[PDB]
Amino acid sequence: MNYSQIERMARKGVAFFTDPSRPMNLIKQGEYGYDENGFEIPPMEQVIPISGATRRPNAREIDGETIRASDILGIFNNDHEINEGDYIEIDGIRHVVVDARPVQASLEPVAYRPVLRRVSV
Amino acid sequence: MNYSQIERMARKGVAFFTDPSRPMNLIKQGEYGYDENGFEIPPMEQVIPISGATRRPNAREIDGETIRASDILGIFNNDHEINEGDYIEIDGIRHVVVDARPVQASLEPVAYRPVLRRVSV
Amino acid sequence: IMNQETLIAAVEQMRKLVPALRKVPDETLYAWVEMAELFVCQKTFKDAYVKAIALYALHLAFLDGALKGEDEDLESYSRRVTSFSLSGEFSQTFGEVTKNQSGNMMLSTPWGKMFEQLKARRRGRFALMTGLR
Amino acid sequence: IMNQETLIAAVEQMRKLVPALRKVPDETLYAWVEMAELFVCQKTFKDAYVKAIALYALHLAFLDGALKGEDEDLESYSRRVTSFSLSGEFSQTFGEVTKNQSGNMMLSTPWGKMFEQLKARRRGRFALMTGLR
Amino acid sequence: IMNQETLIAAVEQMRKLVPALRKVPDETLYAWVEMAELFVCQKTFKDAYVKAIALYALHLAFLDGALKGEDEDLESYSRRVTSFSLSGEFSQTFGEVTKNQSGNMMLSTPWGKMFEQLKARRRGRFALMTGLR
Amino acid sequence: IMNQETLIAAVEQMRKLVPALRKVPDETLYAWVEMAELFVCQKTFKDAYVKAIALYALHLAFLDGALKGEDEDLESYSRRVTSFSLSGEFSQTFGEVTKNQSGNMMLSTPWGKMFEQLKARRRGRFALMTGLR
Amino acid sequence: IMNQETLIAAVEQMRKLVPALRKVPDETLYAWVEMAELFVCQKTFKDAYVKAIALYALHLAFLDGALKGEDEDLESYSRRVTSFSLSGEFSQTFGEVTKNQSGNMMLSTPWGKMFEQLKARRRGRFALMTGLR
């Protein structure tokens, strides 16, 4: 079976349920390393734009301390591959990609369905 | 896809299953801050009217102490955006919006589906 | 149209038949009635002219949905929505109200049928003619 | 103008025949009766004028849901609601009462069928004509 | 070129009859009116030229969704979307407004039916011809 | 084709009717219009020739889907997709836009119907001939 | 053998009309063009031979999915796949583009319909014969 046709269908479907006014960025900080004593920071941010769709909002409850946090799920495109420790800048709010969950039956996955949790607590 | 049409459909649907005789208000108390020793109260109430629909009543059971509390779920409109710590005045009874849960695939959500729990216990 | 009080009477009669038009802006009703006046004959009725104008305007404004107001997009004029649901909160389903297999274009709304009956009672639905000289 | 006492009797007869009309304001019923007066013929059945004029007005009111509430929203005059349902509270499904087979618009409601039966008995449904010479 | 003031009046009449066209840029409406000018005949109904030319332009614009948005993607001019749904947020189903029974392309939209009624009243739908000798 | 400015005018008119072609590469539109020029008669219209060329090209480019662009495989030219869903995230369903039981091949798109109407108004849809000498 | 430059022009025209054929090796396209040469008549439309021979070759290639890939498995030439779906990843459903109503095999693809229109315009679809005496 042809996977290019599936890629085109997935791209058009993602472009259907999307709004071209939500600012979404992506952070790929990496290449860390410790000093000869243990003092160093990763000097990479690598902010790039991205667009997609979101669904299923959910609220965070920890101890009844009224922290008022939330987390959602998203659907994205194949370019700018997502990893297991990246950050997503959704409407000025950072989320961490806990799960990548590519929609994959072949190499070079057609799309990604990451699971995002709000950063900090 | 057009989201204005979805907004109109959601507004008409909410206006269908609603009763224009239930008094419903909304409280947006905010802008707190402590004194130079720690004595101050938030001087804001911001009571505004609102209308919507409710569903799925549920009862509260804690210890068998016969407190007789209850909590429900609601569906509302896009104006007067709901937050994660607001109060809803349903028929003279206060409820706290634990979860916002907007029905969102785009900015400026078309509607909200908050989860309400009765205030106090 | 020839003067104003007939327009006022026609609009008042339309609002009296359907109270839902008490909220519609007045200028739109004026435009609709003065455009529907082109199809009705004054010499035929000559006693219930305002009633005929009101019935024809009401029928003309409700064929397939034309008086939709403002903020309704352009796709609503070519396709109809049959179902809409919001998550697992509620659902709704719509459908057509009248079947018009005859294809007269006047037996599509009750107002059109009433206008046809009134015309048949007043003058008739026939057209019998012969050549001149 | 048609006689006031006859109009009062016709409206009151309409009210007794359909008790659900007791909650409707009198001006709308008066308007419907005056509109229905244009079709009912007087000398055909002069003895029972009130009964049949009330029947014809009732047929006009319930033709295809022509008579709605005062606060009924627009866009429901061209589209009907087949069904609706809330999440876990209730659900309902509607449908049409009967289906026509002749396209007469008169054998579409029970009141219209009663009126046709009365007209056939009292005078008849026939029409024979000849020229004037 | 057709008279500028007449074109302005026709476009403004189109805007008032369908308020949803107020958000469309004027050049596209001008192009549609100029295209519709090629079919409407002048001397037939010279008194009411503007109304019927606006009606015919409206019929052309809403024939089968010929008029789309500026940024509407291609491949939607040959394929329609019956329904769509997100996971647990919303769902919707569409459908066709009415169904033709004659294949005239003119009894397909309400505006076309209005135009045919106006043409039949003003001049007629007939055509009788004989040779020139 | 005989010269260039007519080609420019035709392409500009096609882009004016459908703004979605402002993104299509120019050479493809040139090829489509110069291949659709083979079916239209210049002597027949002789006043709205560019409009006829634009309408015929638009109709010819939209019969069953021919202007699909690049990177679309070869199976898309023999079968159509009616549904597509992605896990439990979203779903979508497509369908045909027009039924053409007549089989004229010109009443398949609105552009074809408009071209037929324009040809009927200009010259006619008949072909009456007799043998020579 | 048919002229080499004409074959090159026909293949290149096929490539520009359908951009998706740019990825197909030239030998297969040459074979298809040579096969389609056996049906196209030369003296009928000598001016536009290349366009119509390319059209007929395109119609032959997309008749019923006759042209498949190099590594396409057998048993798919007699059986088609209506739908498929993985467990929780994706699903898809296919269908036929259009449905024939005459059994001519020529009004089955858009390219064949274009070719028939061109043949009817240039020469005609008629055939009148008499004996030789």
Query: Chain C contacts of E97, Cβ < 8 Å?
Result: 64-65, 78-80
Q: Per this entry, what is the length of chain D?
A: 133
- Characterize A15-41 residue by residue with b for buried, 16 or more Cβ atoms within 10 angstroms of its Cβ, and e for exposed: eebbbeebebebbbeeeeeeeeeeeee
Q: Choose among C62, C29, C14, C48: nearest CA to C123.
A: C48
- What residues of E are in contact with residue B105 (Cβ under 8 Å)? 86, 89
Q: Where are the alpha helices (DSSP H) in F2-126?
A: 5-17, 26-36, 42-45, 49-60, 110-122
H-assigned helices in chain D: 4-17, 26-37, 49-61, 110-122
> CB contact, 8 Å: D77 with chain B?
no
Stated as kind and residue range, the H or E segment containing B4 is helix B3-16
Q: Is the dihedral of CA E72, E68, E104, F56 positive or negative?
A: negative
B–G contact (≥3 CB pairs within 8 Å)? no
| C48-51: long-range contacts, CB 8 A cutoff, minimum separation 24 | C48/C118, C48/C122, C48/D38, C49/C6, C50/C6, C50/C9, C50/C10, C50/C13, C51/C13, C51/C118, C51/D35, C51/D38
What residues are paired with A23 via a beta bridge?
A: none
D32 Cβ neighbours under 8 A, 6+ residues apart: D57, D60, D61, D67
Q: Does E89 touch chain B (CB under 8 A)?
A: yes
User: Which regions of B1-121 does DSSP assign to beta strands (E)?
Assistant: 24-27, 47-49, 53-60, 69-75, 87-90, 93-99, 115-118
- Under DSSP, is residue F54 helix (H, G, I), strand (E, B) or coil? helix
Structure tokens at D58: 């009732």
Neighbors of chain D with 3 or more C-beta pairs under 8 Å? B, C
Could you tell me the two tokens for G2? 């048919």
Q: What residue in G sits closest to F61 (Cα-Cα)?
A: G110
Q: Which residue of E has its CA nearest to A74?
A: E87
Residue E91 host element (H or E)? strand E91-96
Whole-number Å distance between alpha carbons of B86 and E39: 62
Contact indicator for G48, G55 with CB cutoff of 8 Å = no
Total beta-carbon pairs less than 8 A apart between chain B and chain D: 10
> Are A17 and B3 a contacting pair at CB < 8 A?
no
Residues from A in contact with E at Cβ < 8 Å: 16-17, 53, 55-56
Q: Which of A1, A9, A103 lies closest to G89 in CB terms?
A: A103
User: Cβ D80–C96 below 8 Å, yes or no?
Assistant: yes
Confirm or reject contact between E84 and chain B (CB < 8 A): yes
Resolution as reported, in Å = 3.3
Question: How far is E30 from B18, CA to CA, in rounded Å?
Answer: 44
Q: What is the SS3 assignment for chain G?
A: CCCHHHHHHHHHHHHHHCHHHHHCCHHHHHHHHHHHHCCCCCCCCHHHHHHHHHHHHHHHHCCCCCCCCCCCCCCCCCCCCCEEECCCCCEEEEEECCCCCCCCCCCCCHHHHHHHHHHHHHCCCCCCCCCCC
Helical residues (DSSP H) of chain C, grouped into ranges? 5-17, 26-36, 42-45, 49-60, 110-122
CA of E14: how far to CAs of A39, C28, E18, in Å?
73, 12, 6
Pairing mode, if any, of strands A47-49 and A53-60?
A: unpaired
Place of tokens 């055509």: E127
Q: What are the chain C neighbours of D69 within 8 Å (beta carbons)?
A: 19
C102 near E CB under 8 A? no
- List chains adjacent to chain G, taking adjacency as at least 3 C-beta pairs closer than 8 Å: A, F
Separation CA C30–CA C57 (nearest Å): 10
Contact (CB<8Å) G94/F78: no
> Is D95 at the interface with chain B, CB within 8 A?
no
Rg from Cα positions in chain G: 18
Contact assignment for B13 to C86 by CB distance below 8 Å: yes
Asked if the Cβ–Cβ distance from G90 to A104 is below 8 Å, we say no
Tokens standing for residue D116: 């046709």
| Interchain proximity F68–G20, CB inside 8 Å | yes
Question: Which residues face B97 on adjacent strands?
Answer: B116
Partners of chain E (3+ Cβ pairs below 8 A): A, B, C, F
- Answer yes or no: do B100 and A57 touch at CB < 8 A: yes
Q: What Å distances lie between residue F37 and A42, D65, F41, G52, G102, CA to CA?
A: 64, 54, 8, 13, 28
Asked if the Cβ–Cβ distance from C31 to E19 is below 8 Å, we say no
Helix (H) or strand (E) holding A24: strand A24-27
Looking at the partner chain, which of B83, B102, B107 has a beta carbon nearest the beta carbon of A22? B107
Which residues in chain F have Cβ-Cβ distances shorter than 8 Å to E86?
89-90
| C18 burial level (CB within 10 Å; 0-12, 13-18, 19+) | buried
User: Do chains D and F touch by CB distance (3+ pairs < 8 Å)?
Assistant: no
Nearest CA-CA partner of B96 in B78, B74, B80: B74
- Are residues A55 and E87, on separate chains, in Cβ contact within 8 Å? yes
Contact A77, A52 (CB under 8 A): yes
For chains C and E, count residue pairs whose Cβ atoms are closer than 8 Å: 88
Q: Which residues of A touch F (CB under 8 A)?
A: 2, 4-5, 8-10, 13, 16-17, 53, 55, 75, 103, 111, 113
Q: How was this structure determined?
A: cryo-EM
Q: Do chains D and E meet with 3 or more Cβ pairs nearer than 8 Å? A: no
Question: Strand order in B69-75's β-sheet?
Answer: B47-49, B24-27, B87-90, B93-99, B115-118, B69-75, B53-60
Residues of C with Cβ-Cβ distance to B74 under 8 angstroms: none
DSSP assignments along C105-133, one per residue: SSTTSHHHHHHHHHHHHHT-S--------
| Cα–Cα dist D36/D30, whole Å | 10
Distance CA B87, CA B83 (A): 9
Do E15 and C70 form a contact (C-beta atoms < 8 A)? no
Q: Residue E66 in contact with residue C74, Cβ under 8 Å?
A: no
CA distance E89 to chain A (A): 7
Contact B105, A55 (CB under 8 A): yes
Which of the 8 DSSP states describes residue E25? -
For chain G, breaks with the C atom over 2.5 A from the next N come after none
The three-class DSSP label of residue C95 is: strand
